[PDB]
From Swiss-Prot:
Residues given in the record as (9Z)-hexadecenoate binding sites: Y51
Domain of life: Bacteria
Practical applications: This protein is a target of protein engineering. Its selectivity-directing and activity-enhancing mutations have been extensively studied and the designed mutations allow this enzyme to act on non-native substrates and/or in order to enhance production of synthetically desirable end-products.
Protein name per UniProt: Bifunctional cytochrome P450/NADPH--P450 reductase
Region Cytochrome P450, annotated ranges: 1-455
Effect of I401P: 10-fold increase in binding affinity for lauric acid
Annotated site (Important for catalytic activity): T268
Membership in a protein family: In the N-terminal section; belongs to the cytochrome P450 family.
Source organism of the structure: Priestia megaterium (strain ATCC 14581 / DSM 32 / CCUG 1817 / JCM 2506 / NBRC 15308 / NCIMB 9376 / NCTC 10342 / NRRL B-14308 / VKM B-512 / Ford 19)
Effect of F261E: Ineffective covalent modification of the heme macrocycle. Substantially slower FMN to heme electron transfer for the arachidonate-bound enzyme. Product distribution biased towards omega-3
Keywords, sorted A to Z: Cytoplasm, Electron transport, FAD, Flavoprotein, FMN, Heme, Iron, Metal-binding, Monooxygenase, Multifunctional enzyme, NADP, Oxidoreductase, Transport
Binding residues for heme: C400
Function: Functions as a fatty acid monooxygenase. Catalyzes hydroxylation of fatty acids at omega-1, omega-2 and omega-3 positions. Shows activity toward medium and long-chain fatty acids, with optimum chain lengths of 12, 14 and 16 carbons (lauric, myristic, and palmitic acids). Able to metabolize some of these primary metabolites to secondary and tertiary products. Marginal activity towards short chain lengths of 8-10 carbons. Hydroxylates highly branched fatty acids, which play an essential role in membrane fluidity regulation.
Entry GO MF terms: aromatase activity; flavin adenine dinucleotide binding; FMN binding; heme binding; identical protein binding; iron ion binding; NADPH-hemoprotein reductase activity; oxidoreductase activity, acting on paired donors, with incorporation or reduction of molecular oxygen, reduced flavin or flavoprotein as one donor, and incorporation of one atom of oxygen
């Protein structure tokens, strides 16, 4: 039953590339999926991939015996500053499994318990900032969520204070990062990146890369000379030994891991929190239910690790926000061997796939007719959800290593926001999703009304 797969409109020798000439390429690709269905071919000069949108096909793509992680063009461009750190290495590169073995214990339960106090440090700064707003001032949500998540990975992971809440403008790092990511997303559609029209982009790309590397130097300098005894992510990077190869990470790879974790360790969690608050103010009944949980569980001025673990409904709220708007919206795979997808689409060894996660999460055959509704109760029973229906953290051994960190931070912070404030969508905000490879609301503002509960 070999089928012929659809393909969106082409532009001569540029093939489908100009379809990416937009500030919202993932959303453009979702619209193409709406029109073409669960699978479509997408070509650019010298490259073919296939976008998958249905759980029917993606459950086969998640078979690690048949498919391995591929570096998308986006990840290849990010590799220009993230090197062979965990997220931009091939599975078969020595440094992938070696760093994985070394850094996995930094996300154990016992590690999470160790990060918790510093997580609270930053969360309290967020709550205090909002308690200190004047009447009828408002909250810039993604901006403040990015302050929080950047500061949290800096402090918990590296004992470094970005002090983002002492800045009215984004930290230098954030500004460069967003620009490197902008450049990487915009470079996706460039048919001739060597055209001298892009010489300034190339120069600016290097400038932003040094800014990001300078902080990495300072983070490493401060730890090596410190007199304090740390046990955090940096500690493991500098001292951990891989059981398999027996070797620690070398200095060049450590630097790549720091860049990787500073970016991956915050940018998507700030998007998650922004989307979760958006859906909560648009769904007051859900907000109330999660606020009731927050009030019942967070009975102390400072949340404890054990209490965050009991914010189970807040946890479902976050999962449902990742369902509708997974903030890292795609991942890529290649066929390890010739194989047939869905009994219908033969693939040759090396053939590539793109998993379009926001579209997967809208598969009506899985979620039902109410698929656009925000119903955290969808997640009450993981056993009732078919395999590989829900993939906001990627797949298999290349799934997100930071998943527990992200969800613990987001549950703590959202729990505290719902404990301490009522929220008002005072502008009737119209969701507008900015793309920097990752996804985040833009211009989302709310007003908080303090419940006047002491910290
Ligand atoms: C809600 C927040 C987050 C989301 C949605 C998310 C999502 C993802 C996804 C989809 C991947 C797979 C990428 C691929 O297959 O190409 C991934 C990989 C990764 N994530 Fe996350 N992530 C989040 C938070 C974090 C945090 C906080 C950290 C660091 C503490 C982190 C570190 C990583 C790393 C290192 C990888 C590469 C893993 C490997 O291949 O060994 N992520 N993440
Ligand atoms: C933090 C998450 C980063 C990974 C998500 C990247 C997700 N892309 C970000 C923009 C759109 C989306 C994507 O579909 N990209 C493809 C684009 C592409 C396909 C075929 C030929 C050329 C280029 C790619 O990069 O290969
Ligand atoms: C570079 C960071 C990153 C984080 C999540 C998915 C892919 C890449």
């Amino acid at each position: 039953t070999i089928k012929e797969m659809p393909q969106p409109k082409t532009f001569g020798e540029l093939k489908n590339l100009p379809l990416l000439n937009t500030d919202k390429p993932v959303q453009a690709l979702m619209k193409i999926a709406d029109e073409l269905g669960e699978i479509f071919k997408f070509e650019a000069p010298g490259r073919v991939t296939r976008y998958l949108s249905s759980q029917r096909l993606i459950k086969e793509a998640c078979d690690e015996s048949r498919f391995d992680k591929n570096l998308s063009q986006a990840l290849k461009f990010v590799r220009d500053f993230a090197g062979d750190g965990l997220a931009t290495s091939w599975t078969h590169e020595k440094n992938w499994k070696k760093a994985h073995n070394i850094l996995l214990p930094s996300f154990s339960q016992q590690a999470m318990k160790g990060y918790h106090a510093m997580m609270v440090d930053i969360a309290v700064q967020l709550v205090q900032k909002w308690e200190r707003l004047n009447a009828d001032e408002h909250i810039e949500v993604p901006e403040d969520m990015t302050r929080l998540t950047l500061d949290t990975i800096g402090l918990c992971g590296f004992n470094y204070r970005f002090n983002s809440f002492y800045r009215d403008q984004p930290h230098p790092f954030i500004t460069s990062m967003v620009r490197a990511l902008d450049e990487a997303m915009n470079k996706l559609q460039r048919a001739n990146p060597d055209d001298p029209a892009y010489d300034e982009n190339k120069r600016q790309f290097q400038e932003d890369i040094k800014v990001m590397n300078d902080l990495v130097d300072k983070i490493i300098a401060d730890r090596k000379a410190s007199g304090e005894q740390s046990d955090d992510l940096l500690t493991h990077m500098l001292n951990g030994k891989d059981p398999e190869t027996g070797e620690p990470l070398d200095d060049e790879n450590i630097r790549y891991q720091i860049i990787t974790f500073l970016i991956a360790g915050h940018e998507t969690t700030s998007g998650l929190l922004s989307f979760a608050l958006y859906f909560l103010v648009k769904n007051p009944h859900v907000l109330q239910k999660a606020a009731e949980e927050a009030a019942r569980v967070l009975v102390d001025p400072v949340p404890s690790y054990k209490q965050v673990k009991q914010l189970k409904y807040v946890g479902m709220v976050l999962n449902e926000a990742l369902r509708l708007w997974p903030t890292a919206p795609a991942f890529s795979l290649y066929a390890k061997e010739d194989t047939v997808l869905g009994g219908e689409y033969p693939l040759e060894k090396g053939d590539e796939l793109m998993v379009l996660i926001p579209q997967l999460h809208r598969d009506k055959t899985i979620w039902g007719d109410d698929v656009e509704e925000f119903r955290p109760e969808r997640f009450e029973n993981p056993s009732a959800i078919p395999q590989h229906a829900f993939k906001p953290h990627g797949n298999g051994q290349r799934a997100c290593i930071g998943q527990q960190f992200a969800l613990h931070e987001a549950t703590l912070v959202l729990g505290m926001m719902l404990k301490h404030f009522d929220f008002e969508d005072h502008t009737n905000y119209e969701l507008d999703i900015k793309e920097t490879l990752t996804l985040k609301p833009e211009g989302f503002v709310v007003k908080a009304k303090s419940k006047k509960i002491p910290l």
